[PDB]
Design an enzyme around this catalytic site. Structure first.
Site, short mmCIF file in Angstrom:
data_model
loop_
_atom_site.label_atom_id
_atom_site.label_comp_id
_atom_site.label_asym_id
_atom_site.label_seq_id
_atom_site.Cartn_x
_atom_site.Cartn_y
_atom_site.Cartn_z
N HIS A 1 2.50 0.58 13.26
CA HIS A 1 2.69 0.55 11.82
C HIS A 1 1.41 0.81 11.04
CE1 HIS A 1 4.63 -0.56 8.09
NE2 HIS A 1 3.65 -1.40 7.83
N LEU B 1 -5.11 -2.94 4.41
CA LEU B 1 -4.26 -2.74 5.58
C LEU B 1 -4.95 -3.31 6.82
CD1 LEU B 1 -3.30 0.94 4.83
CD2 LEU B 1 -1.68 -0.97 4.91
N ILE B 2 -4.23 -4.13 7.58
CA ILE B 2 -4.80 -4.72 8.79
C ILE B 2 -3.99 -4.33 10.01
CG2 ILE B 2 -5.44 -6.81 9.98
CD1 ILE B 2 -5.73 -8.25 7.34
N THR C 1 2.18 -3.46 16.33
CA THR C 1 2.82 -2.15 16.49
C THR C 1 1.96 -0.99 15.96
OG1 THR C 1 3.96 -2.04 14.35
CG2 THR C 1 4.95 -3.39 16.03
N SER D 1 0.81 -1.22 0.00
CA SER D 1 0.00 0.00 0.00
C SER D 1 0.84 1.27 0.00
CB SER D 1 -0.93 0.02 1.22
OG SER D 1 -1.84 -1.06 1.17
N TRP D 2 2.01 1.21 0.61
CA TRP D 2 2.86 2.39 0.65
C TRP D 2 3.21 2.85 -0.75
CZ3 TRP D 2 4.46 6.03 3.97
CH2 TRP D 2 5.54 6.83 3.58
N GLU D 3 3.44 1.91 -1.66
CA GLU D 3 3.81 2.23 -3.03
C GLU D 3 2.62 2.62 -3.87
OE1 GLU D 3 4.96 -0.86 -1.68
OE2 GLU D 3 6.68 0.31 -0.94
#
Lengths: 147, 152, 147, 147, 149
Positions: free
Chosen positions: D83, D76-77, D81, D51-53
């Site tokens: 994150h 995203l799950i 942390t 997902s960051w990309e």
């Protein structure tokens, strides 16, 4: 210690919750005049419906005239929904932007409280200190340092 | 733990902009930042500009205004924010942090984060080197020197 | 499956908490070389004091030289103050910006944990998977797709 | 009831958690073709590691070719942390930016859930509604309105 | 507010998710401007988008093709079982603020971010609540005028 007789200051305030806005606007003005030698005719006081219009009110104004410093005044109180949280976030980042984009100092005179009592207390009522006074000196100082 | 340096920057011009609210914690920090740069990084006293602003909110604008008039190799923004009764702490911290990060990326000048966002005075002083804590200002000084040099 | 022998990769890592950083940087490098045919000479490894300097370390670097992809590596651990929270937010938004502004892919190799144990586990120690390996492949793939 | 036979749509999805991704990418495509007369050869489907990309994949792509709308799909799950929290925030602001910067509509096909079950349910499995279908129509509608 | 704006061109962009609450809001904003601010019906463009995420983009695209004095972004977001509500609300909010500061056109925040349907409806003037759409209408007129004269 800091006198700014040649300074032109702009004050943009929302109209929601005037019981707290007035004391603040008033203190900001008196402090600049009585303590920093700012001339009354060099202080423009404009208003907008609420705190959301605050950033835009300032941007529009510092585009037409020239000011040395701007103060944004508004009061936000937590309600039943997530409104308070999201608006507060937007206006804060907004004010900061209008200031960094234009090069004009923007003093943060936005109160984000949990209830009316807290706002009034920070407006100088019921034994609290009037935060508007602090914003006035702040504006004077930033105006001078910006030349 | 933090891994500083032993780099020397005698030609570096450093700018320090600090707020004045809560000076009991500010001074130690500013002083720490300055001594460490001089005594440990050979930075010259004449090349260190120290300017101030009322509070943490004016920190980003202070830096921006200053790095436009003069030329610095690195900037250090110092200030202290303590949680109060309202949501003030939360929102200001957020704006100022995003703000410092922007002034840095826009101008190309390294901006060291010397902003303390604590829950109480005690925590601030401790990170200022008092009551047995480590002075974080020393850390910011070496970081400033290092970033200054890497920026050529 | 992807090979990138002509790729020039840049790695910028913070130095705070090297016990976790090293495994990560090492995993990122080995994975690229042994699995993606990336040449050791073509991998620049630079460092900065901490995670806050990460966005600026990358911006400064991708302006002097030309890289196909970058990896930002740092480790942030929740302390007693709100420090962790505010720096994490700033670095994350900042890394994302440096990447969108420049047009160079920036892999997110920033761990934001509650304690040291969590950091090491994600560095491949004590039975955990080394996340640096993942960042390496991501870097190669993004580098190639950027042509 | 909007038809867009002359529209060129772009779909960029992450590869992490393909069990949920596929149903979503598939629903978005089918809906556009079967219900909005979008031509199969006018649909580009590209992927990125995570997902960051996502934001960078879209920016890069809408720079090389010309699309009427783009759909960013990822899952995203929440983990152990912080994150999840920080990446979600960065990707969301990023997608919104790529869209406002370029002028190309960007449909938000990013699921941010607490567990796998919630992700699959919103992918149409186990009695849930497939959200990819919604994203398909949205894309078509935004494509046409952008003229 | 005794402000009249018969020469103002206002734009209203609203999402279509949760129409039960959107309609009262859009209607309130329009009636208020016309009956109370002398705004002309033919000078009020009403456009829609699928959801609140498309709100910023819908406004940007529109204020690029035509010229408006003020814009109102209306939508309703309700907390669900996931973190969706949280992240979309955040993005759309910062987004609307940006579309406004970038273009120079006043953007009125007509976005409700509530915990449940009941709260939304109540702020749309139903079940004894005050219709917030009315307020947004007056706001739009005022900002429109201050942005000119």
């Amino acid at each position: 210690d800091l006198k700014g007789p040649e300074l032109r200051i702009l004050i943009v305030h929302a109209r929601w919750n005037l019981q707290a806005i007035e004391p603040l606007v008033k203190g900001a003005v008196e402090t600049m005049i009585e303590k920093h030698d700012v001339k009354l005719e060099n202080i423009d006081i404009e208003s907008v419906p609420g705190s959301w219009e605050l950033p835009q009110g300032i941007r529009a104004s510092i585009a037409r005239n020239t000011y040395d410093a701007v103060i944004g005044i508004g009061v936000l109180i937590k309600g039943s929904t997530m409104h308070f949280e999201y608006i507060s976030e937007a206006v804060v980042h907004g004010l900061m932007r209008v200031g960094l984009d234009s090069g004009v100092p923007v003093i943060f005179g936005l109160l984000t409280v949990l209830n009316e009592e807290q706002a009034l207390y920070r407006a100088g009522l019921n034994g609290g200190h009037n935060h508007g006074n602090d914003w006035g000196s702040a504006a004077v100082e930033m105006g001078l340092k910006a030349l």
